[PDB]
């Protein structure tokens, strides 16, 4: 991975690093993890509306959305701008709608 991003950290100016280093820094107090824009109660609620509106298709969530939600809700529980109980609630609302669409697809 790109070494040039880590030797150039300055406290509280944002940067990108590979997720396994962000979790290793966040295990100490030495980082905080900025949730992607799609982990916002606005963007999750637009995806839930898309899902209900288009029975024939899955919404354009990123390939890792369940995996990354589960990692960050456990390891970075304090870093969300929205209250994490409403994010867990909407991740479940999306999980359940897509499970119906899968059973229709089979």
């Amino acid at each position: 991975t790109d070494d040039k991003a880590l030797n150039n950290m300055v406290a509280m100016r944002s940067t990108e690093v590979v997720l396994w280093i962000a979790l290793l820094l966040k295990q100490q107090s030495k980082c905080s993890i900025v949730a992607p824009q799609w982990l916002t109660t606005k963007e999750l609620d637009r995806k839930i509306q898309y899902e209900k509106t288009h029975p024939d298709r899955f919404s354009e969530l990123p390939w890792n959305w369940l995996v990354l939600a589960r990692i960050l809700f456990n390891k970075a529980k304090d870093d969300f701008h929205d209250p994490i109980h409403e994010l867990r609630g909407k991740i479940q609302d999306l999980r359940e709608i897509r499970q119906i669409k899968v059973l229709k697809g089979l």
Binding site: Q27, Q28, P83, I84, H85
Partner: protein
Amino acid sequence: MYYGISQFSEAYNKILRNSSSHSSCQLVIFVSCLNIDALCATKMLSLLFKKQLVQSQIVPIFGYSELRRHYSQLDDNINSLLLVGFGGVIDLEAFLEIDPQEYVIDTDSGEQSFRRDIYVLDAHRPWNLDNIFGSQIIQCFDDGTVDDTLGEQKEAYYKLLELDRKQRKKQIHEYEGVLEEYYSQGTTVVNSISAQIYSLLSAIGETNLSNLWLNILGTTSLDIAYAQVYNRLYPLLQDEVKRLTPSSRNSVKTPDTLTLNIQPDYYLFLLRHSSLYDSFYYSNYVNAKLSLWNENGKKRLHKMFARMGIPLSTAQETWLYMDHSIKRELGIIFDKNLDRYGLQDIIRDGFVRTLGYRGSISASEFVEALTALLEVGNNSAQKLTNLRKRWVSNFWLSWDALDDRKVELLNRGIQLAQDLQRAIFNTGVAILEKKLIKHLRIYRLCVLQDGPDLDLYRNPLTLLRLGNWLIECCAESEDKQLLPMVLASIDENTDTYLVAGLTPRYPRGLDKKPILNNFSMAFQQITAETDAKVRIDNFESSIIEIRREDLSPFLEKLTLSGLL
């Protein structure tokens, strides 16, 4: 003196400098098992060294014989030791067979350094002076005792250490006279070991609610026997709960909200996890005010519930299922009624934690659960060792129950605590009905020869539950003189008595300077004088073991002893 309260950061930074590497494990923590405060101290101290990535090993130890065994076999790469909850009152340099010349390195300059540090986290007193002054390897932590209390002993220690005939006679017996008065003080606990480590976390800037809960648990365990110490520390815990609690009030309950309130925590047995009736019936304090072993005491309990206006059929409901109106009215019912019985002191404010939707636990109720895990969580040398192995094995049940991920193990503990307190009570009534407490002028004697599930009382902690129950019971009676109590119980398999010496205490509401456990000297001095077979190896040196036939000769010389 050795590390005062102002300078715990220097002792901690010295651990990081000496014992942090990614190469190896270098740090060992020896923790006394059978001590909740040493458990909560060591839990905090492991969460700290986890966050700093310090590779470490924790070894639970039962007593001094196992301390020598485990120290004797430490790998020579191990260069820091923490002794959590023991060793302040023994000469560790002599006991572990240290000679500092076999440990010194880089002696240049008015200088030394050593290949190992031994940091002693201990709340017991009187401190051994050859640890606190007389060694450079042993490194005690202090609450303030040494500078505040030991200045005459410091001077006496050095003038006697320097002086290796009238001018000599006139002085050597003054300084030995100061040390001889300093020893010939009984044992006491003067602080919590967890509040010491929380004041270290406050120096480093590591405080949070998880470390604060472990500070509250460790300190609450003192309240039963060292009430005078809990009351010093309690004001300081209230301030930290306010400091760390977030801004929101009239907050909605959610699965993620931890709340750590200060609120009414009645001095009752496992209230939130038992009935309202069992809460009173099995409380040490209630039993002591109502004389609740005999059936007129049980009448006084029903007559109280009837007068409070709670049906027995409601009082006996499990507290979750007991009705919503009683549980909010209860503060008013007690503030009206308890005064009639003198039970007014049951009203108390304490710390109550609730996590998400899983229902509140108080610090009082949580230490009752954690102690019940230490006590019962699972050829005489094998018969001792395969028992002491069990008490080391139980330490990890209490440890894992401090984790929020493991509430099912806390719920094991809360059931075991209710099995124990019932057995303590059914034994404590047998003692008081059968008149087994004999008055021996200098002290009170009690000796359990036979009985139902007597094989519990071979754990030192379970003997101390029954001790603290018989002490509360006596300490509230206004006619009895306060006297030291000796409580003995047989093991029919080892063929020894476990003997515990207990300090009395003042009635729970009266408000004096402390009283000290001098059985710790009386047992050693009688042991040194006799040819009897005993064990004097426990860390709470008020507790000993003695072979069955030697006990009556031992007690026969204990009554003669001027040391009590």
